[PDB]
Amino acid sequence: MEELNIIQGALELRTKTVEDVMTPLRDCFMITGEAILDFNTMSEIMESGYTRIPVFEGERSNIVDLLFVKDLAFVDPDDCTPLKTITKFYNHPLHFVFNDTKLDAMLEEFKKGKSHLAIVQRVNNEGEDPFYEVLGIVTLEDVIEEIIKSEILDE
Amino acid sequence: MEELNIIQGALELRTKTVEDVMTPLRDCFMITGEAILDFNTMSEIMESGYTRIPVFEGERSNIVDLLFVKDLAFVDPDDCTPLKTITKFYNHPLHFVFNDTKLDAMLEEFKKGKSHLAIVQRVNNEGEDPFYEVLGIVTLEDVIEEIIKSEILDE
């Protein structure tokens, strides 16, 4: 039954939050703001498979910039351009989302123009001055991937 | 009935081609490759509402570059930077799609990393050496907008 697969795909899609879809921060490929885009660094980036990479300074949860790998397609490793030169040039804005955010809201935000890598946060009320704890990242491609896997659109 | 709305939304989504979703070329906001990003030009761009703009040279159907308005957020009108400086710097690659392409295939292409503005073509076999006729453009946001309008994801 085509219609039951559609229904069941949609029902599952609708129950998902960004927290279910995100890459946890511990698992994310990330890069220090002081990085130099020499061969070893760019090889590691290219070999990671990620196309959107958070840039942190000091602590991994301290994300200060984004790096979009497709923007690196024309950077030459042999010139060792500082990442800071790249990131300060583009200055792409940070996009934060609540861990309970549903995928429809996520779509709506990417459609409004917010950055295609979003940083997932929850409120942490357990240390000592409550803070927003960075849990992981979610990208445009992660959400599109859930839609394709849902098979809702499959002819 | 929640399930019937889902089914009917999906059935409609699935029947759509990029041709149904595209902005026709005649209706598109476009910009000449020789443009200077002075105030009048940037005002016109900002007032258009478009965030992705095809760059043409000579004829409107001769699209040679893309301009992403969010990349203009930090360009200063008073410096009159040539568009060519901007476009030759970024050099974003052109993405062409067949007019019969369905939305699931479209998603899959954007997810593979192809440019988020796609140029819709069909084969024109009526002039004189058949050529691919540019019909319009379709963006990431147009497809996301069809998904949101389908209400498939609505809680």
What would you note in describing this structure?
The structure is a homodimer of 155-residue chains. With 155 residues, chain A is of the alpha/beta class. The first copy, chain A, has a single domain (1-155), classed as CBS-domain. Chain A is 36% helix and 26% strand. Chain A has helices at 2-15, 18-21, 39-48, 83-90, 103-111, 140-150, and strands at 23-24, 31-32, 52-57, 59-68, 96-98, 117-124, 131-139. In chain A, the strands form 2 sheets. Chain A has a 4-stranded mixed sheet with strand order 1-7-6-5. A 3-stranded mixed sheet of chain A has the order 2-3-4, with no helix packed on it. The longest helix of chain A has 14 residues, at 2-15. Chains A and B meet through helix 1, helix 5 and helix 6 of A and helix 1, helix 5 and helix 6 of B. Chains A, B: It is found in: Cell membrane. Chains A, B: This is Metal transporter CNNM2.
